[PDB]
Amino acid sequence: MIKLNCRPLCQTPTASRLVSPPCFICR
Amino acid sequence: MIKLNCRPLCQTPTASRLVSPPCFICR
Amino acid sequence: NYDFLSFMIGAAQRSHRINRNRALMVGDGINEPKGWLKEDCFPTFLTLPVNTGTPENPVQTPAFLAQDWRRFVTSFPAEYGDARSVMHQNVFGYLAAMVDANGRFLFGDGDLTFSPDLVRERIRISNCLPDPTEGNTKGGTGQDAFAAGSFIAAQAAWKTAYYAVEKRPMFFEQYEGGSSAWCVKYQFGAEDGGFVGCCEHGRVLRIG
Amino acid sequence: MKIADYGQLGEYTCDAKCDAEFGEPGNIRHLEGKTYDYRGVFCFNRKNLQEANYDFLSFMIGAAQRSHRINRNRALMVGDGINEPKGWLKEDCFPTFLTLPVNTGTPENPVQTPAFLAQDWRRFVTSFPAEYGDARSVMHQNVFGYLAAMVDANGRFLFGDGDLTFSPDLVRERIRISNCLPDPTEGNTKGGTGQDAFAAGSFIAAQAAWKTAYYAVEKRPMFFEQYEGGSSAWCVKYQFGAEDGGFVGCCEHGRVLRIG
Amino acid sequence: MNFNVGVDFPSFIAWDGTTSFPVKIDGFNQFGFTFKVIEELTADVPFNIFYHEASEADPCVPGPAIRVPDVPFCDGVATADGLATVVIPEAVAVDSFCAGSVPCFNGPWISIAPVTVNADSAKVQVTVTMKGATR
Amino acid sequence: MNFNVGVDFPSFIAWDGTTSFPVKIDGFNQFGFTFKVIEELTADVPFNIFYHEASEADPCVPGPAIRVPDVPFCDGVATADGLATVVIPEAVAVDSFCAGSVPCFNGPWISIAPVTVNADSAKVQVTVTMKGATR
Amino acid sequence: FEASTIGPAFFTPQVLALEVDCNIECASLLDLYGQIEVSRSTFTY
Numbered sequence: 001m002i003k004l005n006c007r008p009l010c011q012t013p014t015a016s017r018l019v020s021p022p023c024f025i026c027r
Numbered sequence: 028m029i030k031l032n033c034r035p036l037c038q039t040p041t042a043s044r045l046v047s048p049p050c051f052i053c054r
Numbered sequence: 055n056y057d058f059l060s061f062m063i064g065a066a067q068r069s070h071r072i073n074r075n076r077a078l079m080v081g082d083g084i085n086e087p088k089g090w091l092k093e094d095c096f097p098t099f100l101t102l103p104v105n106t107g108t109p110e111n112p113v114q115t116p117a118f119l120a121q122d123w124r125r126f127v128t129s130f131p132a133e134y135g136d137a138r139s140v141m142h143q144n145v146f147g148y149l150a151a152m153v154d155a156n157g158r159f160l161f162g163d164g165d166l167t168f169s170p171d172l173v174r175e176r177i178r179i180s181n182c183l184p185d186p187t188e189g190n191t192k193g194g195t196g197q198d199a200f201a202a203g204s205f206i207a208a209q210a211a212w213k214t215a216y217y218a219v220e221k222r223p224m225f226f227e228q229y230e231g232g233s234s235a236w237c238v239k240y241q242f243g244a245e246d247g248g249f250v251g252c253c254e255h256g257r258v259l260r261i262g
Numbered sequence: 263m264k265i266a267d268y269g270q271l272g273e274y275t276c277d278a279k280c281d282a283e284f285g286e287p288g289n290i291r292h293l294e295g296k297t298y299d300y301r302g303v304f305c306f307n308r309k310n311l312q313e314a315n316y317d318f319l320s321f322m323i324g325a326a327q328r329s330h331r332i333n334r335n336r337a338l339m340v341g342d343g344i345n346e347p348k349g350w351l352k353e354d355c356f357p358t359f360l361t362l363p364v365n366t367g368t369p370e371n372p373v374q375t376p377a378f379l380a381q382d383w384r385r386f387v388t389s390f391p392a393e394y395g396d397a398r399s400v401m402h403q404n405v406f407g408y409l410a411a412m413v414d415a416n417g418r419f420l421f422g423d424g425d426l427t428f429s430p431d432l433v434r435e436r437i438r439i440s441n442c443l444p445d446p447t448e449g450n451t452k453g454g455t456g457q458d459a460f461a462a463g464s465f466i467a468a469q470a471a472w473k474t475a476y477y478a479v480e481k482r483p484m485f486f487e488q489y490e491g492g493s494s495a496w497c498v499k500y501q502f503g504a505e506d507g508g509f510v511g512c513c514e515h516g517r518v519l520r521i522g
Numbered sequence: 523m524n525f526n527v528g529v530d531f532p533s534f535i536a537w538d539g540t541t542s543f544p545v546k547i548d549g550f551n552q553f554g555f556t557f558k559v560i561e562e563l564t565a566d567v568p569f570n571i572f573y574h575e576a577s578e579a580d581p582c583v584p585g586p587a588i589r590v591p592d593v594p595f596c597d598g599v600a601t602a603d604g605l606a607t608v609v610i611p612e613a614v615a616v617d618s619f620c621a622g623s624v625p626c627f628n629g630p631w632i633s634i635a636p637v638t639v640n641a642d643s644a645k646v647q648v649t650v651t652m653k654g655a656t657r
Numbered sequence: 658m659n660f661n662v663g664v665d666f667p668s669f670i671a672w673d674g675t676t677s678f679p680v681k682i683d684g685f686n687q688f689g690f691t692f693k694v695i696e697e698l699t700a701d702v703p704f705n706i707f708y709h710e711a712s713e714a715d716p717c718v719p720g721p722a723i724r725v726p727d728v729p730f731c732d733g734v735a736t737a738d739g740l741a742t743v744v745i746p747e748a749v750a751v752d753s754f755c756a757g758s759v760p761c762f763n764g765p766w767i768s769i770a771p772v773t774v775n776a777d778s779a780k781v782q783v784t785v786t787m788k789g790a791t792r
Numbered sequence: 793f794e795a796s797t798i799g800p801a802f803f804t805p806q807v808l809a810l811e812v813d814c815n816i817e818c819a820s821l822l823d824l825y826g827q828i829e830v831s832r833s834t835f836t837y
Binding site for chain 6: 523524525526527528529531532533534535538543552553554555556558560582617619620621622623624625626627647649650651652653
Binding site: 043044045046047048049050051052053054 | 102106115117151153190194195198
């Protein structure tokens, strides 16, 4: 059981969105 | 008449809603 | 190895204090002084409901808005002199969390929390009083709606609306006739009371 | 020790009675706790350790202490009493509060969406019983950012207005920030409407009087030594450990807020 | 750490729900009961306390059962017939227990049994605990 | 005088001769067993020690039985299968008792049942005692 | 003498100098009311 060492070739970490609080809807 | 001393083994959680004043309720 | 006599004395005094404070407020007149909440002599102010439905199909729901508090507080006759309000902490917490139409807070605005100087505001909080919010679970809409007739707050000139009469402070003594050579017995008691003064110098606010 | 109750001794009695009634006395209890043990081990080969041009021994001696600190801090929070200190997020003894949903549909075909609004924070913070004394909140910084980046119906900022960024005095505000706690925004990707809305039941923040709600006991600091019984002429072994513990106190001095 | 608490504080079955076993207390200077339920009760259940004297033929075998007397405290009520008794309220939950004891020792054996054996008494369990061996 | 030992050292039945009852050890710091015979034995009787964990259907009810693993000491021999067991010899007299305990806790509940329910197994009784409360 | 095979009597635990007390009592309004002193069980005004 040889333990492999892994790492990616690409350098594109997925562009994560940012979501902000909606406008003032109320209950 | 011997008097007994009692107390329970297992606890229980307790959850409640939190109600805040509604939108600008108007007359 | 743990002293029980001092513990029992402390328990007695604590129970006396709690009982006296409870009786002066909600006690009945049979064996305890009658409290103003139980007497219910102060004149009452109600609160209008608010229509949450469409104009042609109204849905009358009880409510309590910010301007009601100002209306109640500013209408105390000036002739009676100094006055203060008393109410549960949850009422103040429910009042301080109100917002206007756009979403901005009323009272302390532009800040995370509101904490006015109650000494200058003439408000003294006491958790002994009834809590109309039911542990911060009521006060919304629909199933969360208030219950009609709930106590909210009261205002009066206490120094002439209620009196406290004290006759003898508590005493502890040993009952010689009951304490044998292998036992001991102690006795304690005190006398006190109070009565309602002028019932016109107070006001009560309630839900309608 | 612990004073479970004080009892109700006296009563209001008629003046015609010559005797008096015996009251129910109070109750007291004895409680005790333990201290737990943290242990580990690692191995090296003598030839490689000698010929390598990097100090793996000190690297591991540092990593062990770092892991000890991390694990202790996490165990006091979510541990279970079997072999770890039992945590206050696991015991589930603090009362829980749920945040109501917000309707985003029409009056006749509504759509209920879980939400967290600004006024909920004030409601939660100002509801702490006054008799218990001062208390402090704990949060993940993303929650604070999500709260500070709110706007009203007209597009203007709440809180700091007229400024590019808002940065209040946290110590005065009585808020402490530490990324150890669960994060409800899931790395700033959730918190909007539709598919981006929160998930019901998510942890947000907690408040309590810590100096009397949770206790931490210190017994020993970490130690290292070589294990002569496993060490050989060609490969080596080391051993280390430390002892510590913790237990909950007054369950009434705590409050937890969650998405309903 | 863990201890062999059975060395210093042994415990013995006293009432199984169908049979009563005498419990020897000669070698110990303290003792007390512990009541537990297995399933929800439907009515109150009282219990009697008995002791025994060493049998004539064999000093290591208990004699016939005797009723324990009462002992009023420094001030308080006394039993109607002056004999000690115990009653378990019907409001006891399954996940709990009760602890009681007697102020006096009397004989070197002790026993406990219900007033009337029935389904209600079949749902209760009683165990005795000692302390401080003296031999 | 006499004390109410049940307040500090509660005792619970574990094996009454026909049925096994899970016991909650979660709330106490230490615990131990206690063995007593009610009639002269004729052959060896071994026992098995299990443990349970909270069931997902209800946290207040124990789950299925799991078997405790062994924990060898320095100068000692590990069990053949690495699972704890207790054996009561035939030499035990009816007028004595034995006390044993386990070094590890594992789950919050514990139990003990015989390897086989034979005639001799009905002659033994097992009780559990706890020594310090933590809740 | 493994601790798992001997009685508790040999291990005396530490005694902490603390005492948990969860009891509270709400604030009193007594200071607001008017104070009167008497010396008999009955009075008139």
